[PDB]
């Protein structure tokens, strides 16, 4: 069906975001932000819905996502959290921008 086909395209995108090709700028998004470890004691006051690629992978593997839009909402939530919390001149924001470029251009090629 169409939903399964579109979810395969999403899974392809997810595999690419986690691939060695993008590791130089994708790595801050591989696991949940460890606020305590990074000394970010305001992170969970500012970010109400944390998201990261390991959580997206778990949800895909668990068949949590019912459509491509639900998958895209979680990937974009992850980038939005980064843009909300971090100063715009921080390296992690430059890395988010680069990984979101990879995501948006491939997401746009979604099969209809
Ligand atoms: C999604 N990840 C994050 O939002 C994130 C934030 C901070 C972080 O410290 N953010 C505070 C700035 C100033 O105060 C508010 C905000 C640090 C890191 C983050 O992921 C990996 C970690 C990291 C450690 C070493 C070098 C790095 N280069 C780029 C990131 C990075």
In angstroms, the CA 46 to CA 50 distance is 10
Resolved by:
X-ray
Residue owning the nearest CA to atom 19 of ligand 1 = 28
Coil, helix or strand at residue 99: helix
Pocket test for ligand 1, best of 38, 49, 97, 98 (most atoms within 8 A of CB): 38
User: What sign results for the dihedral spanned by CA atoms 81, 24, 14, 56?
Assistant: negative
Mapped to the 3 state alphabet, what secondary structure does 1-39 carry?
A: CHHHHHHHHHHHHHHHHCCHHHHHHHHHHCCCCCHHHHC
Q: Tokens standing for 87? A: 């100063």
Rg of the chain, C-alpha, whole Å = 14
Query: Which pair of structure tokens corresponds to residue 54?
Result: 């390991």
What letter does residue 44 receive in the DSSP assignment? H
Give the phi and the psi of residue 90 in degrees, each rounded to 5.
-75, 145
């Amino acid at each position: 069906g169409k939903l399964s086909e579109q979810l395969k395209h999403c899974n392809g995108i997810l595999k690419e975001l986690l691939s060695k090709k993008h590791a130089a700028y994708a790595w801050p998004f591989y696991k949940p932000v460890d606020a305590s470890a990074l000394g970010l004691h305001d992170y969970h006051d500012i970010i109400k819905h944390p998201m990261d690629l390991s959580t997206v992978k778990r949800k895909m593997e668990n068949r949590d996502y019912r459509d491509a839009q639900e998958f895209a909402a979680d990937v974009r939530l992850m980038f939005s959290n980064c843009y909300k919390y971090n100063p715009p001149d921080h390296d992690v924001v430059a890395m988010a921008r680069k990984l979101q470029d990879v995501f948006e251009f491939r997401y746009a090629k979604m099969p209809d």
